[PDB]
Amino acid sequence: DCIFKKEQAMCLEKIQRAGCPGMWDNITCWKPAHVGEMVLVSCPELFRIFNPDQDMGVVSRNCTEDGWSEPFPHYFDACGTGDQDYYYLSVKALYTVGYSTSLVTLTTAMVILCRFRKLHCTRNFIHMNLFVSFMLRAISVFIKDWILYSTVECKAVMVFFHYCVVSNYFWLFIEGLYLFTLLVETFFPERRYFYWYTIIGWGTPTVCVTVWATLRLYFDDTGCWDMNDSTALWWVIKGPVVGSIMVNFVLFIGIIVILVQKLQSPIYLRLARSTLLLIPLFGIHYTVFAFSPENVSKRERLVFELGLGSFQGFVVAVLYCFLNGEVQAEIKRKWRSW
Amino acid sequence: SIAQARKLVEQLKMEANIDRIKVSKAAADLMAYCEAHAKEDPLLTPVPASENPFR
Amino acid sequence: QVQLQESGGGLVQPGGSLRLSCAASGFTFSNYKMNWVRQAPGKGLEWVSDISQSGASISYTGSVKGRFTISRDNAKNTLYLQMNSLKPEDTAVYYCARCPAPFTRDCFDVTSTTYAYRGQGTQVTV
Amino acid sequence: ELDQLRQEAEQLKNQIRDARKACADATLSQITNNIDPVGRIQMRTRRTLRGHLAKIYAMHWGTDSRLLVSASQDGKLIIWDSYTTNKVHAIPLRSSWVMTCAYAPSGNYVACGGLDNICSIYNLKTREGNVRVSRELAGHTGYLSCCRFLDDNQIVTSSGDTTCALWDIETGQQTTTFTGHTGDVMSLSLAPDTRLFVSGACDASAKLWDVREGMCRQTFTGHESDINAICFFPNGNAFATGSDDATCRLFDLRADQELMTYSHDNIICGITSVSFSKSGRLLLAGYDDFNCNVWDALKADRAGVLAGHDNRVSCLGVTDDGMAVATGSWDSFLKIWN
Amino acid sequence: QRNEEKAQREANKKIEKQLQKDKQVYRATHRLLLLGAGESGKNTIVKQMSGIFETKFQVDKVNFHMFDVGAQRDERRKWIQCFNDVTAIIFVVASSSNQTNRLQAALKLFDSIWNNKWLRDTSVILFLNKQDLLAEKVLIEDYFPEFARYTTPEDATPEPGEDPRVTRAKYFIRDEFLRISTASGDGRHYCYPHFTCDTENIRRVFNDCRDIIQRMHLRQYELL
Amino acid sequence: HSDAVFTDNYTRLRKQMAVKKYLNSILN
Structure with missing residues (x-):
């Protein structure tokens, strides 16, 4: 039931093989010393989980004639839950329900899109690929949660999870890039671009997750890699995602300025409606908290980005499906044919 | 032009000079053709899979 | 074949009133749009006026705005053109033509020559 | 004097209009009441062709009911195989704008026409690895709307110059001209014995001509708009017409008057293609409401709805043996029904 | 029958x-239709810049495929449906064109085109050719009496050296x-x-x- | 990304809680 003892057990053998003899402490491990000579060590990094900063040595023990003096100054408490657990549990349930709703709505959407042969077009193909990315991202999150709540299976799950997230962020950026490209060049719009977009959307996540995994093994192979305390290693995965958010924001602002140039030809309500429609498809909500450090406004970020962010599927699968004029036309025609 | 009117009157004269049989005779000939040739038409009557090349 | 025979016309003094009746037959009057076209001596066919299917929207050319008027009676399956006043640029042959397609507002080749759906015409003098 | 001719034509037309009604007897409705209704015919698509680019305008089947030729507005005349679905020939046409195509009964030659005012004949007997135009039948004033093959030599074409012409390949010279039409001729059809042909024009009139001596035997009137399609009833003594007034009228050569009408209140769109089946019981007529209808002859009861196309049915043809029916639309897609 | 099937499959691949x-x-080229009156x-x-005199010209390396009506009958009711998928229709009208009212006929033609069911998805470009002849003949109220009371729009930007009347006529x-x-x-x-x-x-x-393709894209994306 | 942030925070909270549970259990 308890695997904590395992590491402590070795101390016993070490002190029995090596007037104040070695004592097997449950809290730490003490080595024999001269009688009446105070011994000071540094508390194990297990106490330092609470305090991320560097550990300090303060814990000391005193010897006596035939043993070790009791720790009167309680040096264990010197070196180095309810509400937070409740918060994380409520957030967990919220994002779960949202991800399930998105999964279902995007499923029925994709099905409808596949059923109609008229709807098939490059733009729709990219929409379907984004829907596939969302499917992968939901299946990843759910599998990760099940496995998590040290082996190789859990590492493979963490890797598939990261890959799916990076794929979703890249497909959102490819969506914005595609629309911007169409606006920028009205003529000769596609030059094997459904191929370049497919490649850059399905290859770069694999490259970055492989790089991350290898760097992890070589430098910081700790546990199942769930925790990402190593800033350097985390930057490799983080960088492309902030870059995607920034570039997508810039492409979105370019589309907005092009649209407002078009609308002013010889309208604020229409622009607001267009922006409200475009924000889900480009994920303009991430830029709000992207600049914020993870420690700062952490609780607000984990609710806005994930708690409410879990319904992005539903939003894009209601704004961009079940109300689309083409979709409505085709479905009504099929109902009439029935 | 005068020529166009001459053409129109001449064509009307030619089309009036020809006699026409009663409608019933033709409606009967068409009905006979339909009943007689019903089997030949696969679209009207189920096509045997053996001779259905598009199965 | 459809016919668009006209009735009326003659020789009158300037400023007179001439009621021109177009007795269309052989088709549903309501479904189509009746258009008036005028052919000046030595000039091509010129559009004059038209009336919608229900008569709600009525249009005239700029030259005859106000002076003229039209009325449609679906029950009698005929068209009328009342010329309240006459001007020296009016002596010509008037034709009542029909819009090529039913249930569509747009009309094609109404003023085109050798058009099938055109009437015999009437002679008006000032 | 014009007045005397006009009066003579007026009285003679009134006399013929009186003679027709006075000779009318059964009127078809009372006599064909006994025959049983065919019932619902729920045919299903068997083959789908998606090799074309632009909207289809015409197609012609083959005598063997195995190979078909189709034309598109992008300049391609593609010969399709109804069995293996594989393309056979693809001749790049010099003129992109084509409105008609014909297949020779022997299958050696294929012809096309359109807005280029020239009829081009192509030979399928390759001699150098490529297929080029053999002879061009230039001379028509207006755009060619239809073309058919009397045999391997004689070809009859109808154009927009209110006349029809007969051509000989070996000499490239006009042999017999058919004049007297006031409206533009839209299509022509050949009788099974090829002795007489009926051409439909834009003046709501259908005229029967003798291919040899070129005189108009009869003129049929009664349509409320321009005739777009023409077909010959298998027997050889009747023909059907279609116009923009959402109705189909059947005329008899020996009765010289109209026999049956196929109109419904729901349909208001025009009719572009009218064909019959082998037995002639069924009339397959295209429509501008983005689908085709199967009108049962002799009763005027709708038998089936061919709602499988996404655009307007430009053309519709049937096989010589009556085994399958091919329908063309503006979605660059060809469908085979059985 | 296997060898014939293989040969047919190879031909199909080619x-x-x-x-x-x-x-x-084909997709690179943009198809355009040129229309106008006799005058x-x-x-x-x-x-x-033969039934149809096709012309080829490249601007900014974009190739355009523009067609001319050429020798054709004046009845445009049937064959006009073939040009429903073109990028745009260029309509050239002589403003100066008088022996007969060409302006009214051009207006009716524009109205018939604009409201065609097949052509309602095809943008129309209007060109007012022969401005110099209009200026000479001016230096209109008989056909359009509303021109007498017409006033120059406040947003008009006439070029220097132009008399007001021709500007107000072309603007009308x-x-x-x-x-x-x-x-x-x-x-x-x-x-x-x-x-x-x-x-x-x-x-x-x-x-x-360019503007047409941009607005078309936007309309598919439901932005505008 | 938000999913990684939540996972790291939740795992750290679970580890800290377990460590506290062990420490107090041993102390008493």
């Missing part, structure tokens, strides 16, 4: 390759065409009146095609 290459070549003088415009004609175009609801087809006499017609048509 035909598919050829169709693919032709497809890509419109579209031949001069064509010089500035432009307003009339815009009003008849916008009298009904317009979806997926727009109107861009322009003044031509001029080697900048290629640039103008290129800009119009």
Whole structure:
């Protein structure tokens, strides 16, 4: 039931093989010393989980004639839950329900899109690929949660999870890039671009997750890699995602300025409606908290980005499906044919 | 032009000079053709899979 | 074949009133749009006026705005053109033509020559 | 004097209009009441062709009911195989704008026409690895709307110059001209014995001509708009017409008057293609409401709805043996029904 | 029968390759339809840039495929449906064109086109050719009495050295065409009146095609 | 990304809680 003892057990053998003899402490491990000579060590990094900063040595023990003096100054408490657990549990349930709703709505959407042969077009193909990315991202999150709540299976799950997230962020950026490209060049719009977009959307996540995994093994192979305390290693995965958010924001602002140039030809309500429609498809909500450090406004970020962010599927699968004029036309025609 | 009117009157004269049989005779000939040739038409009557090349 | 025979016309003094009746037959009057076209001596066919299917929207050319008027009676399956006043640029042959397609507002080749759906015409003098 | 001719034509037309009604007897409705209704015919698509680019305008089947030729507005005349679905020939046409195509009964030659005012004949007997135009039948004033093959030599074409012409390949010279039409001729059809042909024009009139001596035997009137399609009833003594007034009228050569009408209140769109089946019981007529209808002859009861196309049915043809029916639309897609 | 099937499959693959290459070549070119009246003088415009006299010209390396009506009958009711998928329709009208009222016929033709069911998704470009002849003949109320009470729009920007009357006449004609175009609801087809006499017609048509494709894309994305 | 942030925070909270549970259990 308890695997904590395992590491402590070795101390016993070490002190029995090596007037104040070695004592097997449950809290730490003490080595024999001269009688009446105070011994000071540094508390194990297990106490330092609470305090991320560097550990300090303060814990000391005193010897006596035939043993070790009791720790009167309680040096264990010197070196180095309810509400937070409740918060994380409520957030967990919220994002779960949202991800399930998105999964279902995007499923029925994709099905409808596949059923109609008229709807098939490059733009729709990219929409379907984004829907596939969302499917992968939901299946990843759910599998990760099940496995998590040290082996190789859990590492493979963490890797598939990261890959799916990076794929979703890249497909959102490819969506914005595609629309911007169409606006920028009205003529000769596609030059094997459904191929370049497919490649850059399905290859770069694999490259970055492989790089991350290898760097992890070589430098910081700790546990199942769930925790990402190593800033350097985390930057490799983080960088492309902030870059995607920034570039997508810039492409979105370019589309907005092009649209407002078009609308002013010889309208604020229409622009607001267009922006409200475009924000889900480009994920303009991430830029709000992207600049914020993870420690700062952490609780607000984990609710806005994930708690409410879990319904992005539903939003894009209601704004961009079940109300689309083409979709409505085709479905009504099929109902009439029935 | 005068020529166009001459053409129109001449064509009307030619089309009036020809006699026409009663409608019933033709409606009967068409009905006979339909009943007689019903089997030949696969679209009207189920096509045997053996001779259905598009199965 | 459809016919668009006209009735009326003659020789009158300037400023007179001439009621021109177009007795269309052989088709549903309501479904189509009746258009008036005028052919000046030595000039091509010129559009004059038209009336919608229900008569709600009525249009005239700029030259005859106000002076003229039209009325449609679906029950009698005929068209009328009342010329309240006459001007020296009016002596010509008037034709009542029909819009090529039913249930569509747009009309094609109404003023085109050798058009099938055109009437015999009437002679008006000032 | 014009007045005397006009009066003579007026009285003679009134006399013929009186003679027709006075000779009318059964009127078809009372006599064909006994025959049983065919019932619902729920045919299903068997083959789908998606090799074309632009909207289809015409197609012609083959005598063997195995190979078909189709034309598109992008300049391609593609010969399709109804069995293996594989393309056979693809001749790049010099003129992109084509409105008609014909297949020779022997299958050696294929012809096309359109807005280029020239009829081009192509030979399928390759001699150098490529297929080029053999002879061009230039001379028509207006755009060619239809073309058919009397045999391997004689070809009859109808154009927009209110006349029809007969051509000989070996000499490239006009042999017999058919004049007297006031409206533009839209299509022509050949009788099974090829002795007489009926051409439909834009003046709501259908005229029967003798291919040899070129005189108009009869003129049929009664349509409320321009005739777009023409077909010959298998027997050889009747023909059907279609116009923009959402109705189909059947005329008899020996009765010289109209026999049956196929109109419904729901349909208001025009009719572009009218064909019959082998037995002639069924009339397959295209429509501008983005689908085709199967009108049962002799009763005027709708038998089936061919709602499988996404655009307007430009053309519709049937096989010589009556085994399958091919329908063309503006979605660059060809469908085979059985 | 296996060998014939193999040969047919190889021929099908070759035909598919050829169709693919032709497809890509076809999509690059933008198809345009040129229309005008007898007195419109579209031949001069064509010089500035057989049933149909097709012409080829490249601007900014974008190839355009523009067609001319040529020797054809004046009845445009049937064959006009073939040009429903073109990028735009260039309508050249001689403003000066008098023996007969050409302006009224042009207005009726524009109205019939604009409201066609098949052509309601095809933008129309309007060109007012022969401005100099209009200026000479002016230096109109008989056909259009509303011109007498017409006033110059506040947004008019006449070029230097131009007398006001010709500007107010051309603006009146432009307003009339815009009003008849916008009298009904317009979806997926727009109107861009322009003044031509001029080697900048290629640039103008290129800009119009650009704007058309942009607005079409936006309309598929439901932005505008 | 938000999913990684939540996972790291939740795992750290679970580890800290377990460590506290062990420490107090041993102390008493």
